[PDB]
Amino acid sequence: GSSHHHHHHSSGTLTNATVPLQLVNTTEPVVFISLNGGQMVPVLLDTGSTGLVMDSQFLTQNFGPVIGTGTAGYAGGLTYNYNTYSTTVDFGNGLLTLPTSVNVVTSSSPGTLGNFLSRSGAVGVLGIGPNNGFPGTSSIVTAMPGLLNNGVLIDESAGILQFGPNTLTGGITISGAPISTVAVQIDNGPLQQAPVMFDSGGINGTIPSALASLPSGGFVPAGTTISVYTSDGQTLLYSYTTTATNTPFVTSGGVMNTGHVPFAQQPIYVSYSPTIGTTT
Ligand SMILES: [Zn+2]
């Protein structure tokens, strides 16, 4: 499923409601939440995963009894054990969820989840990816009241997250899963059908060797134009030109990861309607 292909490559009666979204170190979208009425804490907005996972420091917090236990991986870089709890999540202005499943890391390697998230300074991952047909695992947004649960508009350059039905027309909409089939074009080459993950935590992104016609293990050369269209090739989702400090890493296999680029460019709506698609 999506989580198997999710990698963060390091280069180094309300219908709607908005909250601040802080961009940290250009690429990291951070929002603040309170768990069970606790202190506001930063979490990383990650469209590439589904699930709220908190650093082990949260074991000191009162989330009630452990309701479940497990082991998982995050973003291809951290292996961890976790406890599951049922607790409320508040985004402020009493925008409060029903109690819902929240995981807390009990041990991890290499290092802690907070250390792994050091680029953002976040202490948890707010995985808001849609996850159709996997009823066990859902974005915490689905536990918001009334129409607030329909989806979230992420607008990094405006500094905002808006819960509820989309209030903008066209734009990019993520639905079904964080991976969808689109068409990808490098420079003025052919449009190629490809699975792509729109991953707001993916930094400067990755592109597979076969798709890019480049050897794996280094970055795409600066001055390379990348354009991503709907699968039919008729509508441009986004385009940019790589730079020496903003360029995807070339992987052997796997799927292309957009990283922050499309989010920095455009408001992107994540829909939780039953339905992986991306439309423009
Ligand atoms: Zn991610």
UniProtKB/Swiss-Prot annotation:
Secretion signal: which residues? Answer: none
Where can this protein be found?
Cell surface
Q: Where is this motif: D(T/S)G 1?
A: 46-48
Which amino acid positions bind Zn(2+), per UniProt? Answer: D46, D199
**Where would I look for the motif D(T/S)G 2 in this sequence?**
199-201
Query: What is the UniProt domain comment for this protein?
Result: Contains an aspartic proteinase-like domain in the C-terminal region. However, the enzyme is inactive. A comparison of the structure with pepsins showed significant differences in the critical substrate binding residues and in the flap tyrosine conformation that could contribute to the lack of proteolytic activity of PE_PGRS16.
Q: Which family does it belong to?
A: Belongs to the mycobacterial PE family. PGRS subfamily.
Query: What does the further note read?
Result: Expression of this gene in M.smegmatis leads to increased levels of NO and IL-12 and poor survival of recombinant strains in macrophages. Contains a tightly bound zinc ion. The presence of this ion is unexpected, and two His residues from the hexahistidine tag on the expression vector contribute to the zinc binding site.
Q: Provide the protein name.
A: PE-PGRS family protein PE_PGRS16
Provide the species name: Mycobacterium tuberculosis (strain ATCC 25618 / H37Rv)
